Structure formats: C-alpha cells, structure tokens
DNA sequence: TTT
C-alpha cells in the first residue's frame, strides 16, 4: 500500500467537502 | 565574540572585504546556523566604530520589521531605498514620503532574506549602487527559488552565483538537539518527512481515517476562537487549497458565512496606491504596502458602474466596499478599498479588461488610444487574504510559534521547489510544527 | 503550481 498518490487524494477530497460544521 | 568557525570567519571576511574596496559579500547560513544571530554582531560592532553610511534593506515588508526590531536602526524595503520600483518595476519614481536616507551615499549596503531576488531586481540594484556601496547579504540558498514567470530556468537568486558576490557558507548547527533543526536539515537533502516527538513541543503529523479531523481538532484546540492567531499558522502551496482552509477556520473562529466580517484583521496582497492628479501629470503615495496588516471597520456588499471609452454599453460588477484602518506599528491612515469575493464574478471583471484590449489594441477611430480608464479602473480594486491561512510562497521571513502544514497540494510542485517548500514549510514554526 |  505505497499509494502516496491516493492517500494524498483521500486527504484532498476530505478538504474539498469537510465535515458538516459543528 | 566567540562563536563557531563560520561566524568567526564570516564577520572578518565581511570586514576585510568592505574595509578593502572591491569584494562583494553574501553569507549563506541555513537553519540552525544562527544567521539572524550572526547579522547582529555585524551591526553592533560597526555602529561602535568609525564606519558611516550603514543602511539596511529588506526585500518585503514582513522582513523589514524583524530586522529594525532586531537591530535598533530604521530599515526599509529594497524598493523604497533604491528609487522605488512598485508592483510593476520602474525607476527614480518616489511614492512614499519618509525622508528616507536612501541617499546612495553609503560605504555599506545590507539586505537579508536574499532567497527571493529575481534577475529584474538585481540588475536595477547594480545600476543603482555607487562605486563605494559594497553589498553584504545573508540568506538561505535552499529556500524557495525566486518566482520568475518569464524564465523556464529554475534558478535560485543571483546573490550566490554572481562573480563579485563570492559567498561564504555556514555549515554546523549548534543547538545540540532540536527536533525541527534535525528535520529541515534532512529535508534540504531530500527526504521530506518523518516524526520526532521530544518534550511535547515538537513536530508530529496526522494520517489515517480522521487525518484532517484529528489535525483540525488539534488546530482549533491550539487556537480556540482566540482571535489571536498571528502565531498559529496554516500554510499551503496552491491558492485553491487555501481559500478552502480559511473558510473552514473562519466559520469556527468568526461565526458567519460572509467572506468578510467587521472588526476582522486581514492581510493585503497589493500596495494600495492613493493616486492624485497634479497639472495633468500623475503622482502617487503608498498608504498600505503589500504585507501590511490592516483591520476592517465597516462591511457592505455593493455594485459599481464600470466603463471605458470606445466600449459599448455598461457592465455589471458586484464587489465589496470596506473601510480599513491601519494595524500594528505603522502610521495610522484610514481609507477604503474595493474587493470582489466571487470566483463566479471575478471572471465578469476580467472580460471588461478583456474586451477593452481589442478596442485599444487598435483604436484608430480618431488619433491615439485612451489607455487611461484601463488602469484607472483596474487600480480601483485590490487583492487580500485572511491572516490564519497564508500560502507557502508568501509565508516567509517571519517565524511563528506553532505552525501547520498541508501536503496534498504539493504533487504539482517539481522536485526542486518541493524541498525549498518544505524547508520554508517546516522552519516557520519555532517550537511546534504540525503537518498532514 | 508560483507573484
């Protein structure tokens, strides 16, 4: 699981639509 | 008086070169080598001896303070001193009024943070200096290579390569164990990440499912709506990544969805020119420089009629009108600016500036083309950004307490900007550095 | 990608 490409995209999309504000 | 060899070597080589006539000097001491420390001895020794004409400079407005607050003698931007060249370069044109001692009557010329100079600024500098103003710089050769959009050459500032500017390098770090220094020392050698936890005030990152949640809930714990966030910093590569970040930060710090709120402190992105017309010839006075921090006073979303000569109809521009007051140490001025906070409508102002070109690219419907209202309209607006989230390129020359980082936007950065992005990316937070 |  050396996917530094995908793992950077998992963090990229979670910034795109961040969690419902609290 | 007693330091490592480099500091014992650098001070003399500087003096033996400027007491002598012709040598040009730059010093390259990277993180840990105490360059900010070594610059001081160069100053306090010289003000005690009979060597006059000592003038200090800075490439930006941020670095000006941290020197004039470090030394005790007034500093200035490298532009303000050398016959100010504004955001678009020029010569011999004075905008500010400070009776600035930029008389070019100087045996010594000092400028720090030499990691930002393009060719355009060095050539003006050489054409400016008298035959007796020796240049002594000090900086970091592994920080971000200067931004030159007009050269495919990925080149660092010329203050290292130039012939006369034969530079000495500092090499040995002294603080026998610093978690940050031990990081940025390997990152300049291209390893780019690891975790080191010592004494709880150090560097550590976040991964996994709740990568950003735990990282954000760490941010908002460090700064719980404190409204005092000058020392807690998030830093990113792109402009797309940033405008997401300060939006998230704001909605928790300043509870609202407005892009701007009253009483908020914002950082500029252009010098606000206050331009007067005298006898038919333009003049200018700078009110707020580029990096100058300022506060909001009154907020309102409005519209404006935009128009240019030779162009049909009227165009619809919707922007902010915000009064602004000066913040920090600078002199107190109060005037107002125009800012558009809509990517949806930022395009609508570009097309006016777009379709106008064709008219002026050939306006033969009588004599010469009237290029006035092109720049007269474009100089109405400005660019700004929030304080909590600034980009990697613009977050330099100022060291903060606790730092934050965002990695995913750095794939598009090449191999050589990467290490210069992380070197400056880690080195900003003095004690604590958190990444992702 | 960058000011």
Numbering used by the authors:
A (entry chain G): 248 to 269
B (entry chain A): 4 to 439
Question: What text does the study give?
Answer:
Dda is a highly efficient monomeric helicase that is involved in multiple T4 DNA processing scenarios. Like all SF1B helicases, Dda translocates along one DNA strand in a 5′ to 3′ direction while displacing the other strand. gp32 comprises three domains: the central core region (residues 21–254) interacts with ssDNA, the N-terminal region (B domain, residues 1–20) mediates its cooperative assembly on ssDNA, and the C-terminal region (A domain, residues 255–301) recruits other T4 proteins. gp32 that lacks the N- and C-terminal regions is known as gp32-core, and gp32 that lacks the N-terminal or C-terminal regions is referred to as gp32-B and gp32-A, respectively.
Peptide 248–270 was selected for crystallization trials with Dda–K38A and dT8. Crystals were obtained that diffracted to 3.53 Å and the initial refinement clearly showed the expected Dda/dT8 complex and additional electron density consistent with the bound peptide at the same location of Dda seen in the gp32–Dda–dT17 crystal structure. Residues 250–264 of the peptide are α-helical, and the termini have no secondary structure. Val258, Leu262 and Phe265 appear to be key in stabilizing the complex: Val258 interacts with Dda residues Ala214, Leu215, Tyr409, Pro411 and Val439; Leu262 interacts with Leu215, Lys247, Leu248, Ile251 and Tyr409; Phe265 interacts with Leu215, Arg216, Met219 and Ile251. Note that the pin conformation in the peptide-bound structure partially occludes the ssDNA-binding groove, which explains why only three nucleotides are bound. As previously observed, the negative control fails to bind and the positive control binds robustly, which also confirms that the K38A Dda active site mutation has no effect on peptide binding.
